[PDB]
Design a protein around this ligand. Structure first.
Ligand code: HEM
Ligand code: HEM
Ligand code: HEM
Ligand code: HEM
Lengths: 146, 141, 141, 146
């Protein structure tokens, strides 16, 4: 993505403080509650019928952690996102056929969850850099569709 | 418009926003300008980089209009009609920009009200903001 | 819902579609499956590649539901409520797919009614299809 | 874009029959009428207050012709779309700040206009190939945003 050296350092410094399990579980949980059609892909997680069931579901937390770990790989490879996400793009596009709009939705939810956890330290400027990161990841995941 | 449960959640959440509506409206605009540079074209460069008074004023108006909307959830088209004429008919604001502002508003709420911005409340606010956006983009002529 | 002028245009245009609604509905689905491969996941492979009966039946139902909608433009939520329960609550159809089908429906109308598919009519049909889509995605729970 | 050799030939054969002025004027005109916020970028064309004014406007026809000529360049350079549209991406993104969603909208309108002009010869299969072409062009034009 197009990040200055100063933005990049700010992006990496925040990531050192990110608990991938806590943030990951919350980001996936919110996606499932706020955009419920996404539930179609996670039947195996069990009961997702209401917010309390979703946020407390151990399978939601475990999968969210894996999703965040993969975001972390992107954050540490900002210059080769397409290559970093090639295999995941195959899975999401060729096996699951997830519409790419949902990649953007998840990216935006992640940003809202970072805002919730970091409060005023998640400045307008730092949010801006994160928006470029999540757009970059969404585009790399959507690569096998094009 | 929304379901009864969403209406309840939105009125409740907005009571926690209270007098900060205008300040949140201004911060949401700032977040939007920095995060989504295409949105800056509708405004003088000076107001975005060398001042803040005009952004704060637009911010207060956004906050006031949302407060009005929360008090008229049964008739949003009637409470916000005039704003669609301005944003769609006169200024030709691209509809995508209301989605961007909505995201930035949710971000701003999460920053200031972390304990009140629960998943259920998040979902209801998202639907509310989408309904407001629909009304604001209803009259391009 | 729509403006009076749009309502007039839609009723008029649909009178020219007449008895071909189901055939157009089936063709729009075919266009969608080939043009937008992600939409195929909701259906058996056999029905998309080795048969046509089930696609034609879904096509007829799409056509019938649009005809119903045209006769109830003042109350779309009431005429199509049951279909939202099925598409959103039960099947969890991604909302993007209604936008794709709408585009394919407009394409299908342009193919068969080139002289009636004028710019003004195109604009009114687009708004109609967007309103139908909104209702169909109204109840994910 | 991902086109088979058979699809590519079908795509090029239809383009030999495309009147860039007629199709171009109609595609831009419909964009302006169906998605009226786009009118913000074409004030110099004059009166765009109603459909008759738009479709008959000589400036709309002349600009539509240029737009279609540029689509034609893409159709004849399917293997290097990013490079073919680099300079146009600069203009649309850095000078005009057009939201990329509008590139997709114009692409879809173009497909509807091809359908209107070619009727039954514009088969579901040929429309499919054209959808890949217009997506490819939209993405190449949006390149300088990423
Ligand atoms: C855009 C950010 C996303 C990233 C970084 C991401 C990442 C991942 C990762 C790391 C895995 C584990 C791969 C494995 O099973 O070996 C995975 C699997 C999966 N992903 Fe995603 N994903 C994203 C978005 C989405 C969304 C939007 C959906 C659909 C709504 C989705 C649905 C799935 C499903 C169904 C699996 C298989 C897990 C299972 O079988 O239970 N992903 N993804
Ligand atoms: C919830 C969404 C929004 C609300 C409620 C809102 C509300 C308002 C209000 C109340 C005014 C002032 C009317 C007056 O007294 O003259 C205004 C002006 C304006 N708005 Fe918005 N607005 C919203 C979103 C946006 C968006 C997303 C943009 C563009 C990105 C935008 C651009 C403008 C512009 C350019 C003006 C004119 C400013 C001036 O003349 O000083 N608005 N808006
Ligand atoms: C204007 C838009 C649409 C209308 C009016 C419509 C209408 C209908 C109707 C009337 C039924 C049958 C209900 C019954 O008697 O059981 C149906 C079923 C179904 N629809 Fe749609 N539909 C639309 C769009 C879509 C879209 C875009 C998709 C997915 C891409 C979709 C997927 C399905 C599926 C999977 C079924 C179940 C088929 C079966 O059980 O045999 N529909 N639809
Ligand atoms: C996605 C397909 C599009 C293509 C292939 C395309 C192509 C072109 C071309 C060839 C030019 C002439 C460049 C020049 O002035 O030297 C141009 C200019 C221009 N384009 Fe586009 N365009 C596209 C979409 C859009 C859309 C969606 C908008 C905004 C709604 C837009 C707005 C403009 C404007 C305002 C000019 C300058 C013309 C003037 O000053 O009157 N374009 N474009």
């Amino acid at each position: 993505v197009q990040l200055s050296g100063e933005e990049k350092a700010a992006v990496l410094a925040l990531w050192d403080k990110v608990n991938e399990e806590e943030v990951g579980g919350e980001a996936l949980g919110r996606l499932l509650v706020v955009y419920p059609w996404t539930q179609r892909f996670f039947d195996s997680f069990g009961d997702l019928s209401n917010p309390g069931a979703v946020m407390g579901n151990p399978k939601v937390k475990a999968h969210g952690k894996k999703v965040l770990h993969s975001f972390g790989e992107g954050v540490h490879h900002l210059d080769n996102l397409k290559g970093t996400f090639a295999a995941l793009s195959e899975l999401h596009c060729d096996k699951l056929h997830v519409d790419p709009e949902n990649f953007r939705l998840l990216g935006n939810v992640l940003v809202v969850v970072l805002a919730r956890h970091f409060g005023k330290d998640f400045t307008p400027e730092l949010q801006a850099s994160y928006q470029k990161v999540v757009a970059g990841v969404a585009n790399a995941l959507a690569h096998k569709y094009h | 418009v929304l379901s009864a449960a969403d209406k309840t959640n939105v009125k409740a959440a907005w009571s926690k926003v209270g007098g900060h509506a205008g300040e949140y409206g201004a911060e949401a605009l700032e977040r939007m300008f920095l995060g989504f540079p295409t949105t800056k074209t509708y405004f003088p460069h000076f107001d975005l980089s060398h001042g803040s008074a005009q952004v704060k004023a637009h911010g207060k108006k956004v906050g006031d209009a949302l407060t009005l909307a929360v008090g008229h959830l049964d008739d949003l088209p009637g409470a916000l009609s005039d704003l669609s004429n301005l944003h769609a008919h006169k200024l030709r604001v691209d509809p995508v920009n209301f989605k961007l502002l909505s995201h930035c508003l949710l971000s701003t709420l999460a920053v200031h009200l972390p304990n009140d911005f629960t998943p259920a409340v998040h979902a209801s606010l998202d639907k509310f903001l989408s309904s407001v956006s629909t009304v604001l983009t209803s009259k391009y002529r």
